[PDB]
């Protein structure tokens, strides 16, 4: 069966730019299989202007004042720079953008005080993306709940709504903030340990807030606010805020829908809080992220009541976390919990909600629900969060029982304002998605997991070894040593196998839908920033060999038999060598000003200058295919490219319906000296005819008279690889 002429969601006829998301591959209206590849734009939208993660001055004051100046991130629309960035991304062959926005940027002023101006800024950015021919899906983005709890996402007033005093987070170790590390009194942000920001998910603030968000009605029934459980208060305000952006786009720029904005991602990498914790007295060996001081859930609660604790600290070794020394954390009586007087002054009383009388303030909310006894520090219900407190034999599943329920509410709101929206389903990190009902999917969905080469990300080193982290997580190996691989070949094949597992989750669970890797990337600040000239007397500056191999391994993993859609994390216009992406020590931008100095009518400087390891992320691939993509192989050193496609007898092929392949000047240009750029390639196709224009290869062929047959096309630069 070919793609239908009417939407499976509404039954209305579809525009000619409609992308079907009803089978294992995206399809255009003429039946061509589409591959969408691009970048996340942008991590820089995680924080307001002039307040990067490492700067404490102004951090609290602007948010307490209800401000949130995010205008002109990710792209500045006043200085002309916005078109140059989009031109670069398009010239690299990208046709997809995962657009990053935060709840904070929409509702920083207070509950239901929406920043309509930032909404209109986003619309203006989306309009330019459309002019440049991008497809876009929207990412409501967060990391460890909010900037105020170590990352990005929610507005500061959500902390007060949860009864948390933001100024006591550091003293109690309830969250590690980059700008208050190692202490608020004497910050040394440059010493912030690599990737420690992620452990905030397993410290007390995130552990509480996420339990509220997804399951407050089950585990914190006394937490009433505006006559609602905190769970509904938080979820309703988040869904309303995203819903107001969607409504704004639908009412003020409806032309963006479906032609440019094709769908919406669900809440980014949601935290699980304490839900499913089997034993509050221990950190499970299965928890894969441990680094720095790591209080157990009960140790963190005692800390949140101001009691000093001696906590295990963890180092990240070649085979994962291993124990270091124990470290004493002494809050010296400081408590995480808002006092009542502070709630009147800075919380409920200021932001304008009414807190219920059984919501005890200034003391641990989990003790208040009987989890532990403060006087004796006795854990009373170690398994409290593993079952339902009032029907305690039943064991809970975070993804099926709480995440999925939030997703029904979220997805319904999206469709209210965007009737043809593709649901990009992002299950919680490292979990399989739940089975979701067709009454909500309605044949218009796409699985959007994230995948990172975790060893490379955490160690900021391209290692000569690696390990199959997904297979370990999923108990496919009897010992972790049999998950280990050595050498480029075995490592690449193993990572490609990991991406195949995620592809398989989709068809096993959700159905015959596409898969898109919503985030994938590598760190560029490897080797103590040797590529930036920061060590060894400057030796190694500009040499991105290691970043290139790491990048190429992750990108190759989306090729092979996987042939995946994906969005690279990320593209950051204001990335710098000193502070990276300006967020928690991460440096994953493809491009940096510090690295400066269909047409070939632009300069090689656009696609090369400022780029890092461009040879690995700018790659040939089929944008649109008559038939089904079967296999992609690309080798940087030889430039050899081979594409195999399964073509059936009922596929549609003619002079206007053909396969289109992107061939980058980066790999295939005759010359890249800073006079029009032009491809100099040899092409071998098993069937049909081809012609090249600019960076585009067009491939016409007849379908088989019967059955199905694999056609192939091979490309390489005449005379081998360039030197860039």
Author numbering: 2 to 598, 645 to 721, 782 to 831
Anything the authors wrote about it?
Screening of three deletion constructs identified one deletion, C. neoformans Sgl1 Δ723–777, that did not affect Sgl1 activity towards erg-glc and yielded crystals that diffracted to 2.1 Å resolution. The structure of Sgl1 revealed two domains comprising a catalytic domain with a central TIM barrel and a C-terminal β-sandwich domain. The main differences resided in the larger catalytic domain of Sgl1 that contains 10 β-strands, 28 α-helices, and several ordered loops. The active site of Sgl1 is located at the base of the Y-shaped cavity and is capped to limit binding to a single glucose moiety. One arm of the Y-shaped cavity is lined with hydrophobic residues and is buried within the protein structure, which would limit the size of molecules that can fit in this cavity. The other arm is also lined with hydrophobic residues and contains a narrow opening that is solvent-exposed. The active site of Sgl1 contained two catalytic glutamate residues found in the canonical topological positions for retaining β-glucosidases. The unique active sites of Sgl1 and Cerezyme suggest that selective inhibitors targeting Sgl1 would not inhibit Cerezyme. In support of this, binding of a Tris molecule in the active site of Sgl1 resulted in the Tris molecule adopting a different conformation than that of a Tris molecule previously observed in the active site of Cerezyme13.
C. neoformans sterylglucosidase 1 (Sgl1), the first gene/protein identified with a sterylglucosidase activity, converts erg-glc to ergosterol and glucose. Our analysis of structures of C. neoformans Sgl1 reveals a Y-shaped hydrophobic active site pocket that generates specificity for erg-glc and which is not present in human and bacterial glucosylceramidases. Sgl1 is an ideal pharmacological target with broad spectrum since Sgl1 is widely conserved in fungi and there is no obvious homolog in humans.
